[model samples]
Target chain A: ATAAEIAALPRQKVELVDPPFVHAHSQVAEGGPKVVEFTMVIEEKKIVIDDAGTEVHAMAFNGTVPGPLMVVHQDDYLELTLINPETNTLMHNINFHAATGALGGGGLTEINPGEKTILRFKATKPGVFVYHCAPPGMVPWHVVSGMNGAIMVLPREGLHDGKGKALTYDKIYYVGEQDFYVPRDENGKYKKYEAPGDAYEDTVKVMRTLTPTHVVFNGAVGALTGDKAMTAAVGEKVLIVHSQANRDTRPHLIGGHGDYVWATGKFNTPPDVDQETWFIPGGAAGAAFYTFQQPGIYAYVNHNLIEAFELGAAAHFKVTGEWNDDLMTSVLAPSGT
Target chain B: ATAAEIAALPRQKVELVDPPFVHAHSQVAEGGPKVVEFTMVIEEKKIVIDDAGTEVHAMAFNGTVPGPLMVVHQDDYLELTLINPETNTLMHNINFHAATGALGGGGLTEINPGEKTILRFKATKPGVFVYHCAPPGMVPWHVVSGMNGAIMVLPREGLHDGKGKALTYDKIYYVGEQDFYVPRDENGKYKKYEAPGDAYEDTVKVMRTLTPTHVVFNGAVGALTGDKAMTAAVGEKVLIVHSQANRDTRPHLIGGHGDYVWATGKFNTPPDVDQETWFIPGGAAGAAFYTFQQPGIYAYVNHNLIEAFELGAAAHFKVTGEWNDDLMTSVLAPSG
Candidate 1:
């Protein structure tokens, strides 16, 4: 198609959706003005990530690593209010890859501690894009410390097939991948800085090593497995949106294939089918749609084995449903063949 | 599409194109076994990279920085013959992000100096992907020293639109982006390593700085500009395949938009249209299609100004034919 022809295609106004860390995908009501509004709080807090063994002095949005998952629609007016309270240390801001101009709003959204600012932009594209804190002098430092998350812009007509057919999912999962570079003390213990400002130099040094000490899903090691493993029913269509703010990641499902995958998270493109794994470039997000064909524990991991097991980048899906003999059956008890 | 549905598509055979430092993109004729074969030799070479008194002892694939670009088709079988001559100074191997098993073929392709090896993998998916040296202890050092290239797997049915319409291009250009880490002596002169094996300790130390001294197109500054600028005729459709085998990159074509862009290089999906700039993640390749609507000189660059200019990652496109005044024209001329 010619450039003029592509630019001439009609665009539709979409309805706005509310912001929540976890919720149904594309829950906006129809006939709205395509306006999505939300407010985020920048806070400096310390959280015990491991079993009381490790603590992270995290700078977070909404007090969490892998902050809230925001969903909106194509052409939606995104009005975001970012607040940094006096109790925090250091100024903060956000840069959304899904939006256009001003470094994806990073240039205009910087707010000092104890201040609040509102920025607006039209959601011009449909894709799962990463949003991160981009304060000057320490962009990667802030992101690795947990001031990152994902915002999904759904197509006005929702996801479609390569041939323009409509497609929907039974559930949506938002998995945010974070790589942490913690400073260590002389004794080789992970150092817990009193403030984000205090950790800046040490953290920057570790980050320059280009080797992350911890790479995990959601927030930290074991955050998304065992008791916290996500649940699903057999045969249910699921869309898993994965975000990696500061490092390249390869997402793979141990016992599944991405029935449909938008590797770069753009909904306008046709989804690749039956991919055992998909690559999510650093600073980007990718979405995978799959259905549980069997009931069991499925592990989702970064395909880089060193990171997956050694560095703690793994998640599990505990699916429940009736077992189908047709899919798989044990031929014999454990015995040497 | 469901997994069952996609698993039912027919697989087609492919033919191998020859291996050279630079060649035409996708020269295989129609009707061949889904197999493509090629051989690559690892050699240590030194050359004067710039007129500014800089020389590099490069560890290269096929004796060139950014190596050679390999093209194949989806579902095609890739049979690679990697040779490490006895004259070479270090062990080497390849890991293709486009392949599936055995550590992207890296595990099976590792060869010591004076040895040779063979590797085969089925290109199950279509996309422009990066290939690099991935030996155990010195992965990044080798890549930064110039052991990286790209492989593009064209979709079997050809590029398609969101509505399943076919798209074709008159030309394809492969631009491999590289970030080099050259150690320097106390005198502030670029140091020449004795051999790839001898440079490991010093190179790794410099690499740990996470700062690249030279980020270039092809091999060095001025490689794709001035007399070496790529040429395109006005009104011709061109596909530009850009690869960043190490660090992340943002490619932007001055005065133009990507009419069709596979931002992550996967052809199974539809291309985004009219993008002023697109992101190519580290260790990945992205392809963009654009037509020369007007004749002029266009600069293709890494959007990061520091890398594009100060670090030398820039290219030029010399488009020929009459300028379209109706599209872009100056209303007034400047007076001296």
Candidate 2:
């Protein structure tokens, strides 16, 4: 019966009070049933995008990529949540360092469907961190499925610089994760994980022509910048973050080169000076920064040379203001003539 | 004065008869005034453009380049009138073989503004001819002004062969004059003429650089077809109007290569056959016809090599239609 119908049915004396169920907090014993739960549904989502005139659906997170830099803090309490909303699939779990060591913290048994586990860990360190659905040898599969992210831990001083200054910059670079351009399947989806020493058949080889069609800056060649245009002021320092999940050694050359490089994403360490290029070996992260007191267009590229041009991999920076007409330094000025 | 006003002012009616002012048609006797009246005017025009992607201007004849081919036969009569309406500084002229000797008929001397002159001539030989402006030194000025052309002559029965039929099959080749790339002025206009060593106190070299922009074959590169497109059908023969104007050299590479070369524009006595590339030295014209049976793009240019690219040259031919896929007489089919 409808509430209105019931109310009108003449049920005289009525009382409004808290209903039957009551909430309670329970304490758990260490390492038992334990309710260890940390899960995620990793599926590749591609959407048509007009990326600077290129029409393509790059591998993305949640149907849109660079997923969303999964941010978290170091030494903080972490509640593991795993959900597999996808139709039919098993084996998935997040192997995060910020979590306690369970199967190398995450390298053992894979999480099956409809299963839940709880995991807790203290943020042991303070810095930008990364998390992925890494469960043993199937780690690449989860990662390639768009299971990747960043965990930025706020220092005790809070998200401020050592000098207690608000962090600001002329430019931002998100460097992490590089993948070979492998063609999708007949359904335009990621392929099943490959066994080591597997020689791809003609059909597989064709798909294996994995040329990196998508490059990411933080997770994908360009994430922090997003679709919003990136800008910088005159003489402002710029930053580039390069990190990779799989293999593919990349040499990044900032066209008009860069003046500084933090060899490997160790921002706390002093940077290499006046470096024109930065080599970010596979499985590592690095960064570069520069300031352009003189204005012009700056192009950033992977100096794999031909690959940069042939595969059409590139990024750009525009500087505006003035030209040193006094000609103290010599270079080919724009052909105004 | 108005006609009505003049009619009223003139009271007396008078009747008169005058002789017609007809053009004199007799050749002047020796020692008499030997002036060949001619007329030519300077006007803006366009040329067959290149792929360089610019609407660049090439000084042309009557506002169109390579002017127009003077289609005349041997024993034909010719008269030319040049009108100089150019108000700018300097002078220009036109000399024809119809009158004066080899010295460019000494046709153009010092023409002033609004001046005109004429030249008459008797087309002498049954061969191709040349008509170019010849100024002092005759090195570059005449050409730089865009004055150049070719004169073709068709044999009475139209040159023939063993089949006893007029050479019929594909297209005609007109090897015109070309080569020269000068820089542009501030407004993208070509600068006025200036000598290399000329004083530059007030002038800049409009020609910032002189890379050979070969203005070859009909003023454009590759402008003919192999089928109804400057072409021929398989197993059919065709005539080649291979003529060169003082390039000092010309290269003719047929469908495969020239099988025969009737050197020096003299088919009556072709020098040889079985030549890979035929060269026609300066001061003489050359032509030859061949039957390719095989089909493909063919090109002709100055053998100086570089000229074929841009210096003093141009080339384009489209060979369409079908051919025996098994024709072993020619080069084997090219593979991908």
Q: State which candidate has the highest lDDT.
A: 1
Quote each prediction's TM-score: 0.63, 0.36
- Candidate 1, residues A146-203: lDDT per residue as tens digits? 8899988888777876678766888888898888887879986788766657777888
lDDT of 2 by residue, B1-336 (tens): 344543333121112111011122211122222222223454434453455532334444444345444433343334456555654333455544223454554444334447666554545555555555565654344454455554454444455432354444244445554544544467744333333223232122422333333445555554332321355554555545443333444454422333344555653443333232344544445555656544555444443323443233535344545643222111111111
DockQ of each: 0.03, 0.00
Among all candidates shown, the one with the greatest TM-score? 1
Candidate 1 CAPRI-style tier:
incorrect
**Interface DockQ of candidate 1:** 0.03
For A197-286, candidate 2 gives per-residue lDDT tens digits of 231232223322234555544333333333422445567776555544433435454535556654433333334666776654332345
User: In terms of DockQ, which candidate is strongest?
Assistant: 1
Give the alpha-carbon lDDT of every model: 0.75, 0.42
